[PDB]
Design a protein around this ligand. Structure first.
Ligand SMILES: CC(C)CC[C@@H](O)[C@@H](C)[C@H]1CC[C@H]2[C@@H]3CC=C4C[C@@H](O)CC[C@]4(C)[C@H]3CC[C@]12C
Lengths: 10, 243
């Protein structure tokens, strides 16, 4: 969950 | 990849590292004289196991975030498919921190920089895993012996991360190609600087794998003892990687 969101961030 | 490509991959890896290295060498070198007192060490030794694990997990997570930022900046990395990005970071992030620790480790008195001062192993005695701590200090002591430059660390950790052998990779050939270019980058720089003498001195491998399995094994014991500390007070990123 959390890593996926870190990789997608601007 | 031509030679011009790998020459310039060198500066580019070093740049990415310099931007995400978290703690400046300059500060760490200066703060070497700043060592916890016996009283502070005692204060740390009086903490509950679980408060100490939580503190440690938070600090490691914080370090891993710079590692994720390093990875996002690495030439080639964001070109891998999402699955493989996550496989590479799940396996190599702790490893990279374990290498990055050698900068924050003072081999003259066997101390690590922790919460604003330098301290020895004994600082972490509350954790209930002295074999692992001991082995983590040793590892840093060995790396420290090599007098690793900042450029070497950058290049070396980029290889620790880009590992085409990690299980679970969908695109093993693309990471194989990337790994090759980073290896060439690493060895070219060592050659240019007259430092190939260290390749034979580098830590074996698994070795980093052993440390990281011990970490997870130890976590697993702690979670069996304090399952609600983990659920309630360990950072999400950390539970994702190691739980
Ligand atoms: C469960 C065990 C893996 C805990 C290991 C722990 O007993 C101890 C050795 C760990 C806990 C937090 C760690 C620190 C977290 C953050 C940093 C900054 C980074 O740039 C390098 C490593 C460094 C300086 C780490 C060194 C190793 C520390 C001090």
């Amino acid at each position: 969950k959390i890593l996926h969101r870190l990789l997608q961030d601007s | 990849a031509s030679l011009t490509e790998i020459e310039h991959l060198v500066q580019s890896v070093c740049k990415s590292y310099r931007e995400t290295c978290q703690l400046r060498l300059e500060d760490l070198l200066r703060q070497r004289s700043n060592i916890f007192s016996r009283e502070e060490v005692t204060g740390y030794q009086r903490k509950s196991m679980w408060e100490m694990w939580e503190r440690c997990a938070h600090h490691l997570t914080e370090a891993i975030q710079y590692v994720v930022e390093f990875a996002k900046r690495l030439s080639g990395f964001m070109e891998l498919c999402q699955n493989d990005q996550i496989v590479l970071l799940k396996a190599g992030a702790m490893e990279v921190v374990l290498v990055r620790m050698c900068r924050a480790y003072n081999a003259d008195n066997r101390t690590v920089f922790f919460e604003g001062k330098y301290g020895g192993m004994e600082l972490f005695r509350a954790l209930g895993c002295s074999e692992l701590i001991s082995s983590i200090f040793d590892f840093s002591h060995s790396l420290s012996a090599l007098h690793f430059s900042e450029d070497e660390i950058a290049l070396y950790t980029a290889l620790v991360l880009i590992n085409a052998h990690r299980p679970g990779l969908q695109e093993k050939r693309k990471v194989e190609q990337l790994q090759y270019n980073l290896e060439l980058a690493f060895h070219h720089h060592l050659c240019k600087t007259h430092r190939q003498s260290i390749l034979a001195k580098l830590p074996p491998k698994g070795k980093l794998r052993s440390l990281c399995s011990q970490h997870v094994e130890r976590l697993q014991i702690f979670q069996h003892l304090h399952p609600i500390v983990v659920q309630a007070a360990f950072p999400p990123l950390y539970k994702e990687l190691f739980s």
